[PDB]
Design a protein around this ligand. Structure first.
Ligand SMILES: [Zn+2]
Length: 737
């Protein structure tokens, strides 16, 4: 009949990141409060109009923020860090919590498994109370533009509390918030609201299973206290846990993710559990950038419609997690661009899906399938790659046998010193080549490489790196020369505060075509007698940082990339580079939300790592760096990698992170990060030696390397040089044998 379409949220950035410019200009004291709010109002009415014109029946209002949607609630609900208690509650206090001012900023955490970061609330003695009418104002504003189509959105109490810190008693904290939400909801209804989106994504997670009863209590409360509201129990990022129980919640509608929770939610509904309820079906991928598979999606929608009292079509999650629009991506090949969909294009998609379901005829529907079909048939999605059956997935010799061979070639001292690869980048001004001969740019880079070689040689580091001055991003630097990769001109996505990323797109089969890092590495090696490490990026980081294809399985993509890394590695080795390092920084973000699904992921990663590194000679030393804190869960996978040396970050834990390696009696090489690289502070000589010796408690000294926690690209040069000089701390422990 008449199928509604909606959306959970929308980006704040604006087509050209004007949002970013506005607020960064405000912090710099370059924008008055008046222009700040007016600027933000312009953006909001703009976004509301786009969504209106797209045909949405329920338009999300409330998710727009000047920094973070969790921070919004903290300030609105009076959950203000103790240290900020005496400050007037206004926009300046708001940004002080987000950024610090006397007082440090609140901490941020990853928003579930996305690349977005929220601001962690800090609970204490102060009682919750409504400090403003943030959401009501936004609602009434929206009404003037879109009318009864305005749908207020907000993060629910249960998720909010679970995402917080300092909470002593979970249920008491939740309960204290109920009256606030009640008034908020009551006012909204009085102002004309009917449907209200209430985000409880905590109920797609393992931790969620602890809060099933709270959910029943909390939402029985709302149904009783605000009977006229049509609540949408909104979830996303995975399937609904304990669907059979949660489906009994006294709400008018459930928001289910059929993109990242397809199997679980599809079986949840096949049960007929939602037959008497309305389903908000998240059928459009809200955190990837591919035009929908219409045949697949529409078929799924029919199945959902038959198993519900009512259906509203929307994306799987807020459009916050994708770029704004493809309309100005003019560098793209038409067949690709026509098969791409960013936020704005998804609004159009959701509308067309609803009209097809209602039996309306639209030429755009089949045309969309035509463009989709053209993409799948593109030559770049049909590249003939290397036959994997002829690729080594294990090295000819075991760790033991390789260690001697490598030791006999390298003759490295006990507790060798080295760095993770990157040095401070002063030049970004030079990189303006704008226009400037490639020869000048290269001469410039090579000059800076030689300079840090001498530095390293004077610090007396045992294994040198070139500095990666030529690299602005550890992922895009590789995708630039790999087939199947592309970059966008304007595809920015907010990560935290005013910071945003422009992820590369993996649109076709990945294939190594030309040397990517060889020139710089070889040149560094030609300047010193000391071993120079090669630095590459692994499949985990590459796929996690990029927008990957969804038309092939994770493992297939991973293996493709592995082959590419193998090919690069072969070039490096042929050119005489004897120590090669594979960098992985996104394991924390790449690891699936559900524990039960994490092994298959790690398995895939381990295999792709073997594909990449098993074709080197036994004398070639393979290192891998992994940005990670907790190793207790994945130590099996790590041993499985069979890396000659894995460099880990221990400084923050004073080496206690070695624990998991101790219990597992890890036999392979380990690099000990003994200095926090994210702090401008220069560690003490005693602070470092103690950090090195802790891991020497049980495991043999012959297994360890000494190095900073991570790359030094973020740090300044002076503190870096001093911090590295450290080598003395290493030389000290070596002295006392
Ligand atoms: Zn790291």
């Amino acid at each position: 009949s008449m199928t509604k379409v909606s959306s959970l949220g929308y980006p704040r950035l604006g087509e050209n990141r004007e949002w970013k410019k506005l607020i960064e200009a405000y912090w710099a004291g370059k924008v008055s409060k008046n222009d700040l709010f007016a600027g933000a109002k312009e953006l909001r009415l703009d976004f509301l109009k786009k969504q209106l014109n797209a045909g949405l029946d329920l338009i999300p209002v409330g998710d727009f923020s000047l920094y973070d949607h969790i921070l919004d609630l903290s300030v609105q609900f009076n959950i203000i860090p103790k240290r900020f208690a005496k400050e007037p509650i206004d926009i300046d206090l708001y940004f002080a919590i987000a950024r610090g001012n006397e007082n440090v900023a609140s901490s941020m955490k990853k928003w579930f498994n996305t690349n977005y970061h929220y601001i962690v609330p800090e609970w204490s003695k102060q009682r919750p109370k409504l400090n403003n009418n943030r959401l009501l104002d936004l609602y009434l504003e929206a009404r003037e533009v879109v009318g009864d189509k305005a749908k207020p959105v907000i993060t629910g109490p249960i998720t909010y509390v679970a995402l917080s810190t300092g909470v002593e008693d979970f249920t008491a904290a939740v309960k204290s918030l109920l009256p606030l939400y009640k008034q908020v909801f009551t006012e909204l209804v009085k102002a004309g609201a009917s449907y209200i989106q209430v985000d409880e994504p905590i109920f797609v997670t393992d931790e969620g299973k602890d809060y099933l009863q709270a959910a029943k209590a909390v939402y029985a409360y709302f149904a009783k206290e605000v009977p006229d509201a049509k609540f949408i129990f909104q979830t996303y990022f995975e399937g609904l846990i304990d669907s059979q129980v949660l489906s009994q919640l006294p709400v008018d509608a459930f928001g289910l993710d059929f993109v990242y929770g397809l199997e679980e939610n599809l079986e949840a509904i096949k049960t007929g559990a939602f037959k008497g309820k309305e389903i908000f079906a998240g059928v459009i991928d809200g955190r990837n950038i591919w035009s929908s598979d219409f045949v697949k999606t529409s078929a799924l929608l029919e199945t959902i419609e038959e198993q519900s009292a009512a259906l509203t079509i929307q994306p799987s999650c807020s459009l916050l997690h994708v770029p704004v629009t493809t309309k100005n991506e003019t560098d793209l090949d038409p067949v690709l661009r026509n098969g791409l969909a960013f936020a704005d294009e998804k609004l159009t998609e959701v509308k067309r899906l609803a009209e097809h379901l209602d039996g309306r005829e639209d030429p755009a529907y089949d045309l969309h399938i035509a463009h989709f079909d053209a993409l799948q048939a593109a030559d770049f999605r049909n590249v003939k790659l290397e036959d994997l059956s002829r690729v080594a997935t294990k090295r000819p010799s075991d760790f033991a046998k390789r260690r001697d061979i490598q030791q006999e070639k390298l003759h490295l001292p006990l507790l060798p010193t080295t760095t993770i690869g990157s040095f401070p980048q002063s030049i970004r001004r030079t990189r303006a080549w704008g226009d400037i001969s490639d020869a000048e740019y290269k001469q410039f880079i090579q000059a800076e490489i030689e300079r840090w070689i001498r530095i390293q040689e004077d610090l007396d580091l045992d294994v040198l790196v070139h500095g990666e001055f030529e690299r602005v991003d550890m992922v895009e630097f590789f995708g630039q020369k790999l087939a199947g990769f592309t970059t966008t001109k304007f595809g920015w996505v907010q990560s935290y505060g005013s910071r945003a990323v422009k992820p590369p797109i993996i649109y076709g089969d990945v294939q190594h075509l030309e040397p990517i890092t060889v020139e710089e590495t070889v040149y560094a090696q030609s300047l010193t007698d000391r071993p120079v490490k090669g630095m590459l990026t692994g499949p985990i980081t590459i796929t996690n940082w990029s927008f990957e294809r969804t038309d092939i399985p994770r493992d297939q993509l991973f293996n493709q990339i592995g082959l590419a890394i193998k090919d690069e590695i072969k070039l490096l080795e042929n050119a005489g580079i004897a120590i090669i390092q594979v960098d992985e920084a996104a394991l924390r973000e790449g690891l699936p939300l559900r524990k039960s699904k994490q092994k298959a992921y790690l398995d895939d990663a381990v295999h792709a790592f073997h594909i990449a590194t098993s074709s080197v000679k036994d004398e070639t030393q393979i290192h891998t760096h992994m940005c990670y804190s907790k190793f207790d869960e994945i130590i099996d996978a790590i041993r499985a990698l069979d890396a000659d040396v894995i460099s880990i970050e221990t400084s923050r834990s004073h080496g206690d992170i070695i624990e998991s390696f101790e219990t597992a009696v890890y036999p392979l090489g380990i690099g000990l990060g003994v200095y926090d690289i994210h702090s401008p502070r220069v560690p003490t000589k005693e602070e470092v030696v103690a950090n090195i010796e802790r891991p020497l408690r049980q495991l043999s000294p012959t297994q360890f390397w000494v190095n900073p926690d991570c790359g030094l690209k973020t740090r300044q040069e002076p503190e870096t040089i001093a911090a590295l000089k450290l080598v003395a701390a290493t030389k000290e422990v070596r002295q006392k044998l």
